[PDB]
Symmetry: D3
Subunit: 226 residues, 6 copies
């Protein structure tokens, strides 16, 4: 690995992955005896214990290209179970800020990264691990957290203009927009890793937030160690 | 409606859809007082009772174009819940003939039918209803049936050659091949229908068959009338 | 073959193919000593004689994927000359219901089936056999039937919405819309089969029918046996 | 028009188009009272009479973009019937040099010119006018000339390397390769022009020529004026 | 070589390429003892002296397919440095007729010629030789000529309609439109040739022309013989 | 802006952009009185003076999606001149480690980000600002630094397998591989920003390094303030 410099045996098999370096640090606090195993290129990685299991929390940055690099190197260091925990913008009216979205699949525009990895333009089913996702539902339900289950659109361009954006994607079965689930799910299927995702609704395109992010992390950590 | 000439209030809200008219007929013998509500163009549709609830069994033929038409017409006729039940070819070594596969997503090559409906070549997530699918898993498990859960490749060409066929699609996270799940799933997300799929393995690319079919149908019907 | 279970030696080299099973049964009365050689999956196939020659009438269902399978298997059973007879929707105002359209080519949206068979997205000329097509023109002329000669658009989505459908395809040299000639013409070119198509206009998007359907059928049988 | 600067009334409705300027000059001697109506950009255009009708012979250069411009402008000058006469490379072993190929359709790789004109990547049937094409067959038959009828591949890159060129295009129903009929057929279908093509086999990729070229030309002129 | 029939040692290493045979001839009067080394298919090529150095002026016709063939054959005949010199249509308001544009890159629609050469649809950078281009800027500046530097769109369809044409390509960083720079630049990068382009503005989409052409040619020739 | 929280009037019009957060900090040391204006999400941004001009050094992370977000927000805060300074892997043998590459254009696979921003799949010329790039050449030459001028390939997948990678891209006119130049150049052309790039060769796919990175930064800063 040339980006994540952690030592082999310093990254757990179970990994909670977030996009924001600051969130990684904030959440490392939920682990027992956390140790910073990497800071190179800004990708903060912490390793500690939880519910009697070793777990790592890693930063993946923004976008398909970035998370692909991070996931590939973590895997080379021993990780094989990944749970994405990030933020998202809801595409439907009935979902409120601070509530969660457990992802069942990801829509995406083809090309680039997908072409290079897949070899052609086939629309390969971009979905998470079935078993793991149900465990997420079970952990969020037990902690009495308000969530919804559905697909999301993994955009590559945050600021690209598209006047019919919300209508187009929501009419396509997607309930929220984010940027790296398609890459995670598809690469995981190709490489044989077990993956899933839960998102915190931070905006609706159709201190209370800190609480929401903290509560969701506990459910995810519970899942990762179940 | 110019293909399925059924009268008003003759098609149930819940529908078990199969590709072979032969199976539609055979399976209708599991209902209470089955009536043939359509035979036009060979698309057999039966409506009767099961566990006290009204339900229908319909023929969709082979291919995306065929099942799209049948689904659109049944929907106009009042249907909104669909569970496809057919046969598939495994793409992995460990699955035996007669066992079952509960579909979690569908891979496909873009163009044609998808382009006309979606209006562009975006890879929209082609997945079943989360809830309904979990119900199928429970039904099949309750009846002690052997099943696997995963994605499948929806092919458009039964006889097209591909020397790398099996390793290609199996390395892409697909455990079996069939021909209409992608159409069913995508159109359902767009139209707002609740769909799922269960397949009977009739061959593995990597009397006893009618019994396997019979047992699985009972589990599916328990789910539609649950 | 796994769909059409007729015994080799039960399928004629000359085949008239129709999408509707009902039409196959009705047109079999035009043959001498008709015999049912297959009913599996609703794909009715009748074989008999017509003016000194053995001829078969087969059902192909709806859509490219369906007719592809049927065509492949009939060929494996000995067929090499196919003339499709079906219904179509006129795209130009001057054509009346009941009249016929003798097809000279097919336009199609690429992808799926064509990609699997051709292996890339090249627009391979989808045309019928030149000779066989002129023989059809002669037969229809001999029976004093009104017809037009032109290209058609082979759609995959009967119900997909397109606010500019008629103008778009008519301005592209097409005079009618159907769903399987492009698959028929292309696969025939690749496999070495001799194929052609005549359609009955059942509606214009821009008793009488029975007789129309019957007269046309006689014209097709003459062509196949001259 | 900015390329062909002939005065309207100097271009016949009936036009025989050839890629080579030299060929245009040589074939003009076949007309009665030939007059040079344009030489701008090397696009030689001659107009005269042939068996009771006014006819023009025009140069179209090499490639789809070139012939597109020339065809558009000749039309703006009054032309509506185009018959291209050129050279071609046979893709099947049985065709000999000097023989002719009467084109029934054109295969092409999509993009560029087709995308700008059609506005998307649909594979619009690229075929000639059915009637005009049969008239050519009749003329060549009347002069006892040896010909074959079939599809051709319209290439854009004469020198691009493809180790499986012959096998690929021949297995796709094409019997020869050229460079501009696809552009000719498609634009004619969209613009409402009546077009056709006959080619002289100058080589097989799988004195005698002069006379071949001359006899064929007489056959084309008869067709254009009958 | 079957298009340009020049003898050995008749084509110079440096070549000024223009699309119009008329200009090739006219421009050859700026050379010392010009000789016509090819007229086949209308592709005029002259070779003579300028500022003591041997150089050639060649006709490439219209369109990517045409210029690709001419460039490949001149290269086989010994040429390896190419400077295209032609006319263009400005896409911005501030550029006046008669002024010049030194090309820094070329935009284009994929497919056709590019697919056959590149073997896939990757957007390969279509740019001129850095060094040669800087030399043109210096030559033109030394001769006090008014020029602009920027990218251009290489169209394949002079007459295709596009109501958003100007704002589309101008908003994409292109300041003018022509038809062969993309082919010239891309093929040069692939074959290892040194190319550049200078265009004379003959119209703006947002006697005195032959003088503008004459002045610019001198600057180009100074560059080729520099 | 929601990622870069700097205040308006806290980001300069001239910006040196690097991918690595650590490099940003390392280089801020070359500025007079540097001030950290942003740390959110790990995107370090410093603002200070150099050669009598205000300049900012900003972190862009890895990949097209990431840099697009950063560039768009910096622009909203007042930046309009960007010079990319990163690392790259050489695709040609003759380029040594620690030497530099001044970029003249970027090759890229289409789709995703480009599709969303461009609206279709046109291969838009992805090039830097002409004037700015020449100034880079002038600054590196004056500091006696060894550099090469050429195009690069902007990959989206660092670890995707491609056995013919070096040959394919180098034969396409690219001398090095990196990941965000295509996005920078194209977005800059669309938005009207002035951009350029210089890369430090850290690997060749065909303390001394610290010195190399430091020396190159001085040349870039000289350019940005010239
Ligand atoms: O519209 C949106 N709203 C809220 N969050 C996001 C996000 C996620 O948050 C990050 C933006 O900083 C991205 O990496 C992405 O995963 N994407 N799109 C949206
Ligand atoms: O490889 C295979 N094996 C077994 N069954 C199928 C099937 C399904 O069976 C039907 C006929 O083969 C199709 O409509 C399809 O859904 N497809 N592909 C395969
Ligand atoms: O618009 C239309 N009008 C009339 N007939 C058809 C048909 C044909 O009839 C069947 C569906 O009604 C298809 O298999 C097709 O061949 N398709 N589209 C049309
Ligand atoms: O392989 C070939 N053999 C013979 N003639 C041609 C031609 C025709 O001749 C010209 C180039 O020699 C083109 O304009 C084209 O129409 N193209 N390709 C071939
Ligand atoms: O819009 C335009 N205006 C002026 N000249 C051209 C040209 C160039 O002039 C030739 C004929 O129009 C072409 O080969 C092309 O290179 N293309 N497009 C335009
Ligand atoms: O093959 C390579 N070698 C050296 N550097 C790079 C880089 C650049 O370095 C970063 C990797 O950390 C990427 O953001 C990219 O711009 N990409 N590809 C290569």
């Amino acid at each position: 690995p040339v980006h994540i410099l952690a030592k082999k045996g310093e990254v757990a098999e179970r990994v909670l992955v977030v996009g924001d370096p600051g969130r990684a640090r904030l959440l490392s606090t939920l682990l027992q005896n956390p140790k910073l195993t990497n800071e190179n290129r800004g990708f903060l990685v912490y390793t500690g214990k939880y519910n009697g299991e070793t777990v790592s929390i890693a930063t993946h940055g923004i976008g398909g290209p970035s998370i692909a690099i991070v996931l590939e190197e973590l895997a080379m260091l021993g990780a094989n179970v990944f749970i994405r925990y990030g933020t998202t913008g809801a595409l439907v009216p009935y979902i409120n800020l601070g509530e969660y979205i457990i992802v069942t699949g990801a829509s995406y525009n083809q090309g680039g990264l997908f072409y290079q990895y897949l070899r052609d333009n086939a629309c390969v089913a971009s979905t998470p691990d079935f078993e793991l996702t149900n465990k997420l539902v079970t952990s969020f339900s037990k902690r009495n957290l308000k969530y919804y289950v559905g697909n999301v659109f993994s955009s590559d361009a945050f600021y690209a203009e598209d006047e019919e954006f919300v209508k187009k994607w929501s009419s396509r079965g997607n309930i929220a927009v984010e940027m790296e689930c398609a890459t995670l799910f598809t690469l995981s299927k190709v490489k044989g890793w077990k993956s899933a995702t839960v998102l915190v609704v931070s905006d609706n395109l159709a201190e209370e937030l800190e609480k929401s992010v903290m509560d969701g992390a506990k459910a995810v950590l519970d899942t990762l160690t179940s």
